[PDB]
Design a protein around this ligand. Structure first.
Ligand SMILES: O=C(O)c1ccc(Nc2nccc(Nc3ccccc3-c3ccccc3)n2)cc1
Length: 266
């Protein structure tokens, strides 16, 4: 990746956007006619929240990761006014929207998503990138309907003692992160359990009307299963959600889970 870019190299298409501060557009590189996505950040209000470092941590990390289940960052550039991210384009949109449409996923689609998820996380963790942000909004779908992890901004190098003032809900964060303690790869396995629950139920297991009561339910790990959640699903989710990070299973055990292997296409 020697080549450096400019807006004049791209034709801007449909807004996919309003993208976590400023939007994501379909775009086509003029010479190759290569279709991709452009994330656009005005840079004044990225500066004003002092995220300028966290953004280039996202850029650096997501740059060196090559996995079929991880969204590519090809490069980036800037002019005086703002900063641009050149990203792999995921044609089928966000998992979040698919979940709004179906309202919940069956066991086969869910198990497949989890499998793809664990695979990408195995890869991330081998490099000791831990995502820590995993949620349906950060998940994209490729042309074959395969899951793709995006938005690595909050991702870190393990272990982390990090301060990192918290934003998005509390819903996907485990007790060790919300209580401000040391944490490791096991963070992502908790998020995986939260995600698996949400996929099948249509709602995250600790969901509540206030930030403060969500904190409570996460700390005390209080969640209940609707009747239609099968025994094998409950088992995997119950294993994933454990106050003690060390009681959480390895991604390998997840991939070898009888409920996973039964319903997974993969
Ligand atoms: O709605 C559609 O038609 C649609 C079709 C194809 C898409 N595919 C796509 N491809 C690459 C990046 C990207 N970003 C986002 C765009 C909109 C909303 C959220 C994100 C995002 C997701 C994860 C992390 C960061 C940003 N979206 C996206 C939407």
């Amino acid at each position: 990746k020697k080549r450096q870019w400019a807006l004049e190299d791209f034709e801007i298409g449909r807004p996919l956007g309003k993208g976590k501060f400023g939007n994501v557009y379909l775009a086509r590189e003029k010479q190759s006619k290569f279709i991709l996505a452009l994330k656009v950040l005005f840079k004044a209000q990225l500066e004003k929240a002092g995220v300028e470092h966290q953004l280039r941590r996202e850029v650096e990390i997501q740059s060196h990761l090559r996995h079929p289940n991880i969204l590519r960052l090809y490069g980036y550039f800037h002019d005086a006014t703002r900063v641009y991210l050149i990203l792999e384009y995921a044609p089928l949109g966000t998992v979040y929207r698919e979940l709004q449409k179906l309202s919940k996923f069956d066991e086969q689609r869910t198990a497949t998503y989890i499998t793809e998820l664990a695979n990408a996380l195995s890869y991330c963790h081998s490099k000791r990138v831990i995502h820590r942000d995993i949620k349906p909004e950060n998940l994209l779908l490729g042309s074959a309907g395969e899951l793709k992890i995006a938005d690595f901004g909050w991702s870190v190098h393990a272990p982390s003692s990090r301060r990192d003032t918290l934003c998005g809900t509390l819903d996907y964060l485990p007790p060790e992160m919300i209580e401000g303690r040391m944490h490791d790869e096991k963070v992502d396995l908790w998020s995986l359990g939260v995600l698996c629950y949400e996929f099948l139920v249509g709602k995250p297991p600790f969901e509540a009307n206030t930030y403060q009561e969500t904190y409570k339910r996460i700390s005390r790990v209080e969640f209940t299963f609707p009747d239609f959640v099968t025994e094998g699903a409950r088992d995997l989710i119950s294993r994933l959600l454990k106050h003690n990070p060390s009681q959480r299973p390895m991604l390998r055990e997840v991939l070898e889970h009888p409920w996973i292997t039964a319903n997974s296409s993969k």
